[PDB]
Design a protein around this ligand. Structure first.
Ligand SMILES: *[C@@H]1O[C@H](CO)[C@@H](O[C@@H]2O[C@H](CO)[C@@H](O[C@@H]3O[C@H](CO)[C@@H](O)[C@H](O)[C@@H]3O)[C@H](O)[C@H]2NC(C)=O)[C@H](O)[C@H]1NC(C)=O
Ligand SMILES: CC1(C)O[C@@H]2[C@@H](CO[C@@]3(COS(N)(=O)=O)OC(C)(C)O[C@@H]23)O1
Ligand SMILES: CCCCCCCCCCCCCCCC
Ligand SMILES: CCCCCCCCCCCCCCCC
Ligand SMILES: CCCCCCCCCCCCCCCC
Ligand SMILES: CCCCCCCCCCCCCCCC
Ligand SMILES: *[C@@H]1O[C@H](CO)[C@@H](O)[C@H](O)[C@H]1NC(C)=O
Ligand SMILES: *[C@@H]1O[C@H](CO)[C@@H](O)[C@H](O)[C@H]1NC(C)=O
Ligand SMILES: *[C@@H]1O[C@H](CO)[C@@H](O)[C@H](O)[C@H]1NC(C)=O
Ligand SMILES: [Ca+2]
Lengths: 145, 72, 19, 72, 72, 401
């Protein structure tokens, strides 16, 4: 076939471009021993995981089902924009109200070995219950939430 | 985690002091109940059904907007 | 100076209890 | 159900399912291919990196049958 | 599915509170628990898991729990 | 001698409901609480006098029994032991009445029990929170020292990639508690392999296992880190080569390899042919960690090489599997029947029940069921336990006026 310039060429197909990308990364990632992988890629054989999709590329009876499925989801790309708006609108508000107020937790006094609860109990103006003191803390899920 | 609320509402659980009675301090250590299974299995079936209706009753209300077409 | 007598490597030993 | 009046409503459902079966299987198969792709991607990103000092969790990405069942 | 799950997991959802012992004969006594990082002496109990599959009613309940998604 | 004879004449049971066993569990309370007794056994409440010779509450009427906190006081093994070790009480008493200046005399059993004669409450771990009774007689220096002949270990840690995380925490705790079971007559050296073997510490040969060397090895082991592919052949070459190094001081006895791995599919048959051909070196293999890698090769090296295989899947399995390797090493000492019943005295140490500096004389006790009617001898290659009678250093200082 062609490559690009020809109209019906190789890359003008939609699946052949990703077929080509996968084989390109197969050629490149196996060019490591020559340079001892001095580039320190750690990022090119992760294209190998796209190789199962070449089944869809080889069986058009699967593509004309995949296209139907992707066709039924185009109307959804306005709930998504509606969804990502809501997520943003409730994030802005979160930023105003809880922005730094999740960093003190109630740890047992027990100086040295601090204890805390197993579900850690935060502080605020709502202070520590009985014999606990309000120490510093990374966030709730090791700082992620 | 409704399943664990159901399990922690079951029978033989402790009981609150009630600070209003002289008896039933050591006894009435049965302040759960095994109707929790019915209480949570049914609600999860009712709330999940009564919501489905509220969903469909809305969807079918706007079914003209949702099946709008450029032709029609 | 170490102990005079020590016992290892008897031929009669029953090896068939590995685990 | 054959003895009731609901037989048609259900035999027709089974007929419509059995007719469209090369397109239900070829569609569960695409769900399976995308689960496989995401399982292999998760193996690349997180394969063997889950050995924490607590112990590797059951929701691993180390081997394939345990990457499939966490993408699930 | 509940009948199959009973055939498949009946009586197998048992565990000793001490991970080293794995039978009701062995699971008796006291044991030191190191894993709480407090190293405290607890008692060995032989338990079931809370959602098991040892009777078709229990299979149905713990499959309803899977259906609602929670804690599967 | 009495213990050997009495055990040889004990018939196994499982029925202790009506034919009970009565004994004094050292970890009971003084309060007359009948809720302190047991289903399968009945507890003595003793009358304790106070003595200055021991400094504690003594009662010369019976021998106390200490059962570890991990071991159930009423399992079948423990109830059989609590039965057949009740003639020891009258032998204890006759021993004392011959010589009244005798300190603790203890039978430390292979089931974990210790039965010590002048019955006293267990020192500090009877009943009080935040202090747990971690005593286990099968680890005490006199027991380790009478239950086997001196060792030459070489501890082969597997620090490769796959042991990182929990398995490495467990490996370094296991190796610490393996070094803890070593005397001054035993020589040790810790080596670690990942695609090439190297010492974890500064010692390049088998050094003596004294307090200072053991501390160096522990502090090296705790610094160890997991990285790289595993090579069993290159690590076992190192192990076998370090046990053939005779230029150094050694306990020229009981060469051992303690392989602390998790699992693979390498059996290294060729290197066990080339280095351990006539099987002079034993190989004990430990499978540490909660994992799923193959355990076939590990279970096979132990069989091929007179060893034994232990699984250490969590902390709390750490403490038992080491004293188990000693359980194995005492077979040749059993088989040489009465050439092995020599009393041996331990280095000075501090008594568990507080009396200060005491050496202790030990003597292993053998299992003698099938004798003069020679039988299968399934486990007649293990010892019942170790007898040990203490001597105080203050007692020796009175003979040197
Ligand atoms: C000293 O060695 C003797 C044998 O050389 C040990 O005696 C035997 O111990 C085993 C278990 O350790 C007994 O097996 C059990 O027997 C009962 C009744 O037959 C059976 O129900 C169990 O399933 C199991 O087979 C065995 O009976 C017992 N006696 C003999 C004659 O074999 C003895 O335990 C050793 N001493 C110590 C302190 O371990
Ligand atoms: C819009 C709707 C309901 O979904 C589309 C499209 C055409 O039919 C589908 C339905 O799936 S199936 N296998 O039951 O025919 O089948 C395929 C071909 C998978 O596409 C399905 O009809
Ligand atoms: C012209 C018809 C084909 C349309 C273009 C190709 C679509 C399929 C290739 C991309 C599939 C997703 C790849 C990213 C990872 C899920
Ligand atoms: C098309 C966008 C869909 C919504 C994406 C939300 C992501 C939030 C993180
Ligand atoms: C000719 C067949 C008659 C069957 C009458 C009862 C049919 C009930 C509906 C069957 C739905 C099957 C779905 C199975 C799960 C994918
Ligand atoms: C006492 C045994 C458990 C009782 C559980 C009650 C509910 C059982 C049915 C759950 C829903 C099935 C669909
Ligand atoms: C073992 O138990 C039986 C039953 O009480 C008893 O008769 C026997 O004397 C016990 N053995 C010893 C050595 O005391
Ligand atoms: C031992 O620990 C020290 C302290 O961090 C470290 O610098 C050193 O690298 C460790 N040992 C080796 C051989 O790396
Ligand atoms: C041991 O001594 C011999 C004899 O001097 C010497 O040849 C050898 O290199 C020394 N070292 C070892 C490890 O054998
Ligand atoms: Ca490895």
């Amino acid at each position: 076939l062609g490559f690009i310039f020809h109209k019906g060429s190789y890359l003008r197909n939609g699946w052949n471009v990703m077929d080509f990308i996968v084989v390109l990364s197969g050629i490149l990632a196996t060019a490591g021993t020559h340079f001892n992988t001095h580039v320190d890629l750690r990022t090119l054989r992760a294209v190998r995981v796209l190789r199962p999709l070449k089944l869809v590329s080889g069986i058009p009876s699967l593509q004309i089902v995949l296209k139907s499925i992707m066709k039924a989801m185009v109307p959804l790309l306005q709930i998504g924009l509606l969804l990502f708006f809501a997520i943003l609108m409730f994030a802005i508000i979160g930023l105003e109200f809880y922005s730094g107020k999740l960093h003190r937790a109630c740890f047992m006094n027990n100086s040295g070995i601090l204890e805390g609860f197993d579900p850690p109990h935060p502080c605020g103006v709502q202070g520590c219950p009985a014999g606990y003191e309000c120490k510093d803390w990374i966030g709730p899920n090791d700082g992620i939430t | 985690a409704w399943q664990e609320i159901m399990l922690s509402c079951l029978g033989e659980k402790g009981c609150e002091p009630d600070t209003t009675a002289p008896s039933g301090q050591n006894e009435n250590e049965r302040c759960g109940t095994d109707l929790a299974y019915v209480y949570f299995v049914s609600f999860i079936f009712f709330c999940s059904f009564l919501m489905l209706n509220l969903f469909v009753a809305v969807i079918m209300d706007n079914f003209e907007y949702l099946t709008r077409d450029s032709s029609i | 100076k170490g102990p005079d007598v020590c016992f290892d490597n008897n031929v009669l030993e029953d090896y068939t209890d590995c685990g | 159900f054959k003895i009731t009046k609901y037989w048609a409503s259900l035999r027709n459902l089974v007929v419509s399912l059995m007719s469209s079966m090369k397109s239900i299987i070829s569609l569960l198969f695409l769900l399976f291919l995308f689960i496989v792709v995401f399982a292999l991607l998760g193996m690349q990103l997180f394969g063997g990196r889950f050995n924490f000092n607590d112990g590797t969790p059951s929701a691993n990405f180390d081997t394939f049958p345990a990457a499939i069942m966490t993408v699930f | 599915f509940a009948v199959i799950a009973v055939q498949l997991f009946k009586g197998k959802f048992f565990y000793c509170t001490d991970s080293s012992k794995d039978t009701e004969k062995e699971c008796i006594g006291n044991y030191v628990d190191h894993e709480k990082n407090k190293m405290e002496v607890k008692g060995r109990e032989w338990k079931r898991h809370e959602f098991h599959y040892d009777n078709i009613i229990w299979a149905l309940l713990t499959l309803f729990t899977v259906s609602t998604g929670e804690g599967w | 001698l009495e213990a050997e004879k009495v055990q040889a004449a004990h018939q196994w049971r499982e029925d202790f409901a009506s034919n009970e066993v009565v004994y004094y569990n050292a970890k009971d309370d003084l309060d007359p609480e009948k809720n302190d007794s047991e289903p399968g056994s009945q507890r003595i409440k003793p009358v304790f006098i106070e003595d200055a010779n021991f400094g504690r509450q003594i009662s010369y009427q019976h021998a106390a029994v200490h059962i570890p906190t991990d071991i159930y006081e009423g399992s079948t093994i423990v109830l059989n032991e609590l039965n057949w070790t009740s003639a020891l009480d009258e032998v204890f008493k006759k021993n004392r009445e011959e010589d009244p200046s005798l300190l603790w005399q203890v039978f430390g059993s292979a089931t974990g029990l210790a039965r010590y004669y002048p019955a006293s409450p267990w020192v500090d771990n009877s009943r009080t929170p935040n202090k747990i009774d971690l005593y286990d007689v099968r680890r005490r220096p006199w027991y380790i020292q009478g239950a086997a002949s001196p060792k030459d270990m070489l501890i082969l840690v597997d620090v490769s990639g796959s042991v990182s995380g929990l398995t490495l925490k467990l490996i370094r705790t296991s190796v610490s508690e393996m070094l803890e079971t070593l005397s001054d007559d035993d020589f040790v050296n810790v080596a670690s392999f990942n695609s090439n073997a190297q010492d974890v510490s500064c010692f390049q040969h088998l050094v003596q296992a004294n307090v200072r060397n053991k501390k160096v090895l522990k502090d090296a082991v705790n610094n160890i880190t997991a990285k790289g592919i595993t090579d069993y052949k290159k690590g076992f070459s190192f192990a076998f080569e370090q046990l053939l190094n005779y230029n150094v001081s050694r306990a020229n006895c009981n060469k051992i390899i303690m392989l602390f791995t998790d699992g693979g599919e390498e059996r290294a048959q060729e290197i066990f042919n080339k280095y351990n051909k006539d099987k002079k070196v034993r190989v004990f293999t430990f499978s540490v960690g909660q994992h799923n890698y193959d355990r076939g090769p590990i279970q096979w090296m132990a069989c091929e090489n007179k060893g034994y295989y232990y699984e250490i899947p969590s902390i709390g399995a750490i403490r038992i599997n080491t004293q188990e390797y000693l359980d194995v090493l005492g077979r040749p000492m059993v088989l040489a029947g009465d050439k092995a019943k020599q009393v041996q005295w331990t280095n000075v140490y501090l008594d568990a029940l507080e009396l200060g500096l005491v050496i202790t004389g030990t003597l292993p006790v053998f299992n003698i069921t099938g004798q003069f009617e020679n039988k299968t001898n399934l486990k007649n290659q293990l010892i019942l336990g170790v007898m040990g009678v203490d001597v105080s250093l203050e007692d020796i200082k009175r003979l040197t006026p």
